[PDB]
From a paper:
We chose a derivative of DMAP as the artificial cofactor due to its low steric demand, which will facilitate its inclusion into the protein scaffold. The protein host around the cofactor was rationally designed on the basis of high‐resolution crystal structures obtained after each variation of the amino acid sequence. The location of the catalyst is in a shallow cavity at the surface of the protein. The system was evolved through repeated cycles of mutagenesis, activity tests, and structure determination. According to the presented structures and calculations the catalytically active site is too shallow to undergo interactions with 1.
We describe here the use of an artificial cofactor employing the well‐known biotin‐streptavidin system to catalyze a Baylis‐Hillman reaction. As protein host, we chose streptavidin, as it can be easily crystallized and thereby supports the design process. There are several examples using streptavidin as the host for these cofactors, since its natural ligand biotin binds strongly (K d∼10−15 M) and is easy to modify with catalysts at the carboxylic acid group. No enzyme is known to naturally catalyze the Baylis‐Hillman reaction, a very versatile and atom‐economic C−C bond forming reaction for the production of various functionalized compounds and intermediates of active pharmaceutical ingredients (APIs).
Numbering used by the authors:
A (entry chain B), B (entry chain B): 11 to 133
C (entry chain A), D (entry chain A): 3 to 135
Write the structure that this text describes.
């Protein structure tokens, strides 16, 4: 797998959150996320998908994953999905944008979703 | 599981795309997506997460999932993540916003990501 | 014009007027001949009271292939009654015709400390029509 | 003022000037005393040529707790050289100080047919500084 080895490993973003991921041979992503920010403590299950056969033209590798913010310590009734691309090489990075949706009443639904961007670097 | 039965099943969105999902007992989401739009043909693997213990106060249930747009028929070098909440009842619906990231060169990276909103209804 | 009034572009008359979204917020806009959008916004939701000044831009010469007309506008949520230290931009398109519509997505950013910066921005979607709830 | 010039608010002087994002696009803005944002935009990327009019709004009385100052602005991508039938809104905050910054997210919506409506909108993030590349 071209990027299997490149994607799999331990990453950290600009907040200092940590993203431990394994890129499967079938395109699957699995691992754990630990947020340095928000209503989060310890590690949360993640799962996702990546393009296991990216273009050979210098293109990044598209990928995405979801965390639901429930674990054995806390439940923030929320989920974040990161959508981005892996860029291999010198400085491998995963450049993402994300959508954090909280469970709300219908009167509060208009304000359910935060949006942001995380840049990940490896170890 | 409160919403296990509610979330699991076959959903269709406003474009007529179909979202077949199984809500796991551990918070996992799995299934297949078939897009009525874009560079997509037939079904694509999805995986995601949902809050398996949502608030009892009339709140929706937060959830998210990823499709990488590679299957046996086509590869669009792209991934969509849907971020939203399930709202049970009369009219069960899953109200989402999504981020579609394509693999790009670094000169084209500024325009890598589309954003939209899909509303799903069951069968 | 032939009757003596001024000649309106396309979307000038269509966009200009009073609009309502699914929250029941009120969007009073005047589309300028130069591409300017001006007016007021009254939100039915959130930390908002009375009317807020808005300004924006729209494509005053849109494609003639059936496509909508692109536009956008900003409200900063400060007026003489309230300051929510935040601003919303709507980006969308106008779709003319029988039931005219403005279909938008929006980005609401709040002023924050650097430590709360990751959570500065809300995202959503509003559909506007000229029919009142 | 004491020397005879006009008294600038906070962010009035800080925001007003010439800015550059990581693409090397050029953002020339004047922050009005009334909360108005006006100026021009020259994009180094995409279907754009020369300068585009912009308008927006900013919080002219921001919190005094160290938080940034919220703002937003629209460009419709039509000028006398090019029409990309599309409009970008930036939503973000101004962070004053040693290296002042404007940290934004943006929504670029194109006019589309209803069948291409699902793909109307691009999303991204630009950081602006007053230092040129
Ligand atoms: O704080 C968390 C869980 C931790 C999120 C951490 C985020 S993930 C993207 C970013 N990258 C990181 O590395 N860390 C941050 N969850 C909700 C709870 C309730 N919230 C809302 C929001 C809007 N409406 C209603 C309620 C606010 C956030
Ligand atoms: O079309 C697809 C795959 C099918 C996506 C279907 C989408 S999922 C959200 C929405 N809800 C649905 O039910 N269906 C649609 N993928 C890319 C290919 C290259 N694209 C870009 C975009 C920006 N920059 C570069 C390249 C455009 C889209
Ligand atoms: O509520 C308002 C002002 C009114 C917004 C009304 C919104 S405009 C899009 C939608 N369409 C409408 O018609 N009406 C609603 N402003 C902030 C300030 C504090 N907020 C945050 C969020 C994140 N971090 C820090 C602070 C949350 C909300
Ligand atoms: O390229 C431009 C105009 C220039 C935008 C420049 C952008 S502003 C945010 C970013 N920051 C900058 O400094 N520069 C860039 N416009 C459209 C028209 C056609 N497009 C679509 C997309 C989706 N559906 C249909 C058509 C793609 C691009």
């Amino acid at each position: 797998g071209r990027d299997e080895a490149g994607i799999t490993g331990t990453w950290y973003n600009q907040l200092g959150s940590t993203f431990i991921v394994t890129a499967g041979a079938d395109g699957a992503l699995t691992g754990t996320y630990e947020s340095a920010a928000g209503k989060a403590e310890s590690r949360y299950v993640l799962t996702g998908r990546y393009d296991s056969a990216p273009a050979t033209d210098g293109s990044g590798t598209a990928l995405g994953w979801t965390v639901a913010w429930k674990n054995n310590y806390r439940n923030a009734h929320s989920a974040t999905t990161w959508s981005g691309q892996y860029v291999g090489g010198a400085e491998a990075r995963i450049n993402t944008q994300w959508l954090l949706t909280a469970g709300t009443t219908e009167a509060n639904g208009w304000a359910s979703t935060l949006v942001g961007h995380d840049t990940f670097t490896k170890v």
